[PDB]
Design an enzyme around this catalytic site. Structure first.
Site, PDB file in Angstrom:
ATOM      1  N   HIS A  14       1.168  -1.020  -0.124  1.00  0.00           N
ATOM      2  CA  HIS A  14      -0.058  -0.093   0.262  1.00  0.00           C
ATOM      3  C   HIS A  14       1.032   1.274  -0.038  1.00  0.00           C
ATOM      4  O   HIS A  14       2.167   1.145   0.313  1.00  0.00           O
ATOM      5  CB  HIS A  14      -0.607  -0.043   1.350  1.00  0.00           C
ATOM      6  CG  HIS A  14      -2.162  -0.891   1.351  1.00  0.00           C
ATOM      7  ND1 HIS A  14      -2.951  -0.996   0.308  1.00  0.00           N
ATOM      8  CD2 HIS A  14      -2.476  -1.795   2.153  1.00  0.00           C
ATOM      9  CE1 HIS A  14      -3.795  -1.958   0.705  1.00  0.00           C
ATOM     10  NE2 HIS A  14      -3.499  -2.483   1.677  1.00  0.00           N
ATOM     11  N   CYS A  31       0.023   2.594  -4.263  1.00  0.00           N
ATOM     12  CA  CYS A  31      -0.670   3.880  -4.506  1.00  0.00           C
ATOM     13  C   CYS A  31       0.063   5.039  -4.058  1.00  0.00           C
ATOM     14  O   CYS A  31       0.952   5.095  -3.392  1.00  0.00           O
ATOM     15  CB  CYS A  31      -2.117   3.737  -3.633  1.00  0.00           C
ATOM     16  SG  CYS A  31      -2.879   2.219  -3.604  1.00  0.00           S
TER      17      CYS A  31
END
Lengths: 139, 18, 92, 92, 139, 18
Positions: free
Chosen positions: E87, E129
């Site tokens: 992430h 991300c």
């Protein structure tokens, strides 16, 4: 493949040459920037671009300069290039009167804001500081 | 500092001219 | 449908956070080198080959000098950000 | 002598500020594409050619589907940051 | 010119596969990431890299992992590669227990910190991300 | 919002599977 260069003209090339700044900003005079602008002009012009040089542009000019540029019709253009010469800071370039985020200048060419350049190269050459760190070098 | 001043004002330059 | 962020390319004179050099006598390191490479290969090489050679030229052939010690013998390396989807040649 | 920040290359799956897509079935877009292109052209092309092709593939052969309209039919473009000073071929 | 590839080996390829994160962080499970790691390992191995796959690494492990990798002797290596799968948010990547700025990870290979990789290409592939923005598309 | 939540926690996946 490569981008299709089969068009009337290579494209428009804007050169923003900020050298003298407002007393307020506290920024210094960028001696030698005219040398860079003359070389860039001669250089990109020989590549085939339609080069225009604008000096000591305020933040308002820079935005407009690029906004209107994106409103033009690049249907017969292959690509587009913009050269920025100025004092700078992380994600930011100096106009003569203040600072402007680099992303607001480039945003004028994002998709719907300039269908004429979709699928065509948009080049941004940026000669400006991005902080005050100095590379000491090695070996 | 002074060094910092010149840098944040963008006055530091290469003198390799000579 | 294509991404609205695609087909953009940025050629920065220095990496994020650093200072960008120039000599009032010859101008920016980045520009002197961009023009020189473009003047010799502008019409034969692909955009990334050009910029990659500019990266080498300013990395190897440039080094500062200043009366002040805190600014002497420093270096610089250009930064290229590409969101391009094809090879780019200026030879139409 | 050379810059400490030279010879680095960052191949980001997406552009600054954006989300990065993945499929619970076949994995993320950037990796699926990076791999297929590497399988074929890995021993032939230069990473920039490699990564430029990757940029093209995730930008044209990928679009999202979601039962939520907020996330339906979205696109993605990777981001290549380069400080390399020479061409890179994984071969001889 | 191109980088010199005449070394005993091409180099080391470190893969950090973060799929499960601690309850606290609130970050979800990254389904499809085991397929990624499988593909990447299979792929970089055939290119000739010495692939090592690490799973669900904490912020501590990730720093240590890379620090000790940069302390090795890469004299006989052509380059170095590191693939990050996790992430992320603007300028940062997630460990299973928290957040780490990417700059601190790549710092271990900068200059004096790894004289052994100097003049050799250091590649970082990052699948993570960088914010929550969504590209809607065009035409 | 639910949209912003699902995104920051990276739970929004592509369903092009099927």
């Amino acid at each position: 493949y490569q981008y299709n260069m089969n068009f009337e003209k290579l494209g428009k090339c804007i050169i923003i040459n900020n050298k003298n700044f407002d007393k307020v900003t506290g920024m210094g005079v960028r001696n030698g920037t005219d040398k860079d602008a003359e070389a860039l002009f001669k250089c990109f012009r020989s590549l085939g671009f339609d080069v225009i040089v604008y000096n000591d542009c305020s933040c308002a000019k820079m935005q407009d300069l690029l906004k209107k540029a994106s409103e033009e019709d690049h249907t017969n253009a292959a690509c587009f290039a913009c050269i920025l010469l100025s004092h700078g800071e992380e994600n930011v370039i100096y106009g003569k009167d203040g600072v402007t985020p680099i992303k607001d200048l480039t945003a004028h060419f994002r998709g719907a804001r300039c269908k004429t350049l979709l699928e065509k190269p948009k080049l941004f050459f940026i000669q400006a500081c991005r902080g005050t760190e100095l590379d000491d070098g090695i070996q | 500092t002074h060094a910092d001043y010149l840098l944040r004002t963008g006055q530091v330059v290469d003198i390799s001219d000579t | 449908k294509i991404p609205v962020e695609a087909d953009f390319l940025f050629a920065y004179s220095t990496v994020p956070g650093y200072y960008s050099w120039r000599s009032p006598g010859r101008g920016s390191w980045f520009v002197q080198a961009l023009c020189s490479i473009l003047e010799e290969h502008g019409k034969d090489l692909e955009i990334m080959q050009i910029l990659t050679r500019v990266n080498d030229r300013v990395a190897r052939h440039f080094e500062s000098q200043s009366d002040d010690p805190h600014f002497h013998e420093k270096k610089q390396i250009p930064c290229v950000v590409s969101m391009l989807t094809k090879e780019l040649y200026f030879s139409q």
